[PDB]
Amino acid sequence: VEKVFFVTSPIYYVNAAPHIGHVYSTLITDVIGRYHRVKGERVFALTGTDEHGQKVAEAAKQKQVSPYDFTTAVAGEFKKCFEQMDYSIDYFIRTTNEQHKAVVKELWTKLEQKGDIYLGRYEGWYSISDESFLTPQNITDGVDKDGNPCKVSLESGHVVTWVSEENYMFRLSAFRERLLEWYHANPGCIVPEFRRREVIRAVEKGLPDLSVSRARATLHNWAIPVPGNPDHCVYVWLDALTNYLTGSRLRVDESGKEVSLVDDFNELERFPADVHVIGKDILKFHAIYWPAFLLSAGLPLPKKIVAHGWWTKGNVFDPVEKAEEFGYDALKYFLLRESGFSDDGDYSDKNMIARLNGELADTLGNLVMRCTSAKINVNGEWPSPAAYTEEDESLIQLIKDLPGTADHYYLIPDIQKAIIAVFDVLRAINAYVTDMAPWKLVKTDPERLRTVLYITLEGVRVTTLLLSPILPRKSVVIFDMLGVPEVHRKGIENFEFGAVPPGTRLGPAVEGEVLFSKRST
Ligand code: MET
Numbered sequence: 474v475e476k477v478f479f480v481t482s483p484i485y486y487v488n489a490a491p492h493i494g495h496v497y498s499t500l501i502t503d504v505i506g507r508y509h510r511v512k513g514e515r516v517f518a519l520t521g522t523d524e525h526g527q528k529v530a531e532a533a534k535q536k537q538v539s540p541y542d543f544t545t546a547v548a549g550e551f552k553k554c555f556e557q558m559d560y561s562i563d564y565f566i567r568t569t570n571e572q573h574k575a576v577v578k579e580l581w582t583k584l585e586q587k588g589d590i591y592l593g594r595y596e597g598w599y600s601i602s603d604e605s606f607l608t609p610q611n612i613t614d615g616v617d618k619d620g621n622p623c624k625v626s627l628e629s630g631h632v633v634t635w636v637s638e639e640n641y642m643f644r645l646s647a648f649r650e651r652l653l654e655w656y657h658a659n660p661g662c663i664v665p666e667f668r669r670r671e672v673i674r675a676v677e678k679g680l681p682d683l684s685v686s687r688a689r690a691t692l693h694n695w696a697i698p699v700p701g702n703p704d705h706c707v708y709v710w711l712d713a714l715t716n717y718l719t720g721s722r723l724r725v726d727e728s729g730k731e732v733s734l735v736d737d738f739n740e741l742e743r744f745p746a747d748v749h750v751i752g753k754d755i756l757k758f759h760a761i762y763w764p765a766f767l768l769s770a771g772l773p774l775p776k777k778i779v780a781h782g783w784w785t786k787g788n789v790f791d792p793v794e795k796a797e798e799f800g801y802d803a804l805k806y807f808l809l810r811e812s813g814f815s816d817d818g819d820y821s822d823k824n825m826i827a828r829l830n831g832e833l834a835d836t837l838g839n840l841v842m843r844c845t846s847a848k849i850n851v852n853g854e855w856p857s858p859a860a861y862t863e864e865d866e867s868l869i870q871l872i873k874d875l876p877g878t879a880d881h882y883y884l885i886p887d888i889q890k891a892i893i894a895v896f897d898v899l900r901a902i903n904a905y906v907t908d909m910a911p912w913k914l915v916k917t918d919p920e921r922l923r924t925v926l927y928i929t930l931e932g933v934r935v936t937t938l939l940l941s942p943i944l945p946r947k948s949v950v951i952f953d954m955l956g957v958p959e960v961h962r963k964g965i966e967n968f969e970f971g972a973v974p975p976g977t978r979l980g981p982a983v984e985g986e987v988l989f990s991k992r993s994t
Contacts, residue, residue, distance in 0.1 A: 526709030
């Protein structure tokens with residue numbers, strides 16, 4: 474069924490400045506968005522900020538400034554950061570937005586009418602820093618900034634506090650069977666698979682009901698009032714999760730400002746999310762609470778939740794800084810190549826340089842220069858191939874198979890594997906070039922060079938197309954060197970081998986141009 478491909482990041486708490494975690498989550502969101510746009514689909518990619526709640530209000534009180542001022546400023550820092558990082562997110566949502574607040578009230582009211590919200594009590598542990606309710610099994614002993622004996626979260630290690638409050642309760646327990654049915658009927662709905670197993674095991678064990686309001690004093694009045702009861706505020710997570718629904722309902726202008734909230738999500742064809750990108754730290758909220766709310770409201774469920782191995786929240790790592798040093802595309806490639814769904818990845822300067830030099834410069838960059846060199850490509854054009862050998866055909870087969878292979882990986886989604894698949898083809902092309910030695914062929918066998926050169930050019934085009942969501946700016950430079958017309962830089966038609974006809978002219982040269990400058994050890 475044709476709809477707008479809808480991909481999201483988490484919305485980030487504004488208690489603190491943007492750092493690598495948020496940049497990474499949003500980068501994944503952006504790449505998925507970009508790949509689907511490259512496929513020729515309609516796309517709406519969403520990111521933003523989570524601005525209410527005890528955590529933010531206490532950060533504001535520490536900084537000695539009003540929550541309104543504080544959130545607006547920090548939100549500004551997130552926007553600047555995401556502009557600097559050269560993402561292509563369609564909209565930046567803030568939970569302080571009045572249209573979002575309206576949507577939250579609608580959803581709350583819907584849950585209440587459905588009978589799924591009642592007045593009760595929460596008495597138990599709470600991590601303010603995670604805005605999370607915890608059972609006694611999920612806490613243990615530890616220390617605070619003052620070095621005092623306190624209780625901490627087993628999840629996150631943050632300080633926990635005992636809360637005893639009359640709260641509005643959501644009947645989460647009533648949704649256990651339906652959630653299990655959903656997980657089992659849609660075994661690709663949570664990625665990676667071991668995180669899916671975790672969610673299933675947790676829900677199988679049983680679900681308590683969930684507090685969805687707090688006393689207003691507790692949150693320093695910095696939250697959305699409960700409809701028909703201004704003594705209570707809406708739980709920051711029901712508030713926050715609802716952003717995906719709000720985003721799905723905002724008409725947005727050319728400048729990126731929201732201009733209108735539609736009544737019916739179907740009008741914009743975005744809801745529900747095709748992919749919610751999150752960190753492992755917020756899996757329960759997105760794979761248990763969120764769908765339970767949607768089930769209560771009779772709203773459609775998201776297709777995929779992908780949870781990565783990082784946390785969303787004297788060893789600094791600043792992505793803007795590193796991008797200015799090593800290059801923006803390069804840095805993005807590294808972050809997406811270096812790690813899959815684990816915390817198991819060497820993010821040092823040494824490894825960054827190793828991948829820059831080895832993969833980007835020596836494998837990709839070298840190859841681009843070879844097939845566009847005046848020495849080898851004497852006519853500065855795509856030549857017409859002669860007859861193919863069996864060796865030619867083996868390389869051609871790999872290039873033809875690549876789009877389907879990379880497509881599946883992108884759709885999982887598993888961006889690391891998609892990159893590896895493309896670079897496996899790039900290594901193969903390099904080896905082919907080394908065996909055919911086109912530099913010798915210029916004098917020896919011009920007819921044979923035509924064939925070798927054409928396959929090389931075409932291999933570079935196809936790999937680069939499939940890499941364009943990862944290296945958005947560098948892909949443009951490469952296509953410019955190859956003289957690939959704009960029309961051939963996107964669309965599934967152009968995944969096919971042979972889409973750029975012989976006789977196409979290469980792009981102009983530059984006196985000492987390089988794609989990726991190698992760096993010292
Ligand atoms: C609805 S996604 C909310 C994410 C949360 N504010 C965090 O930073 O972990």
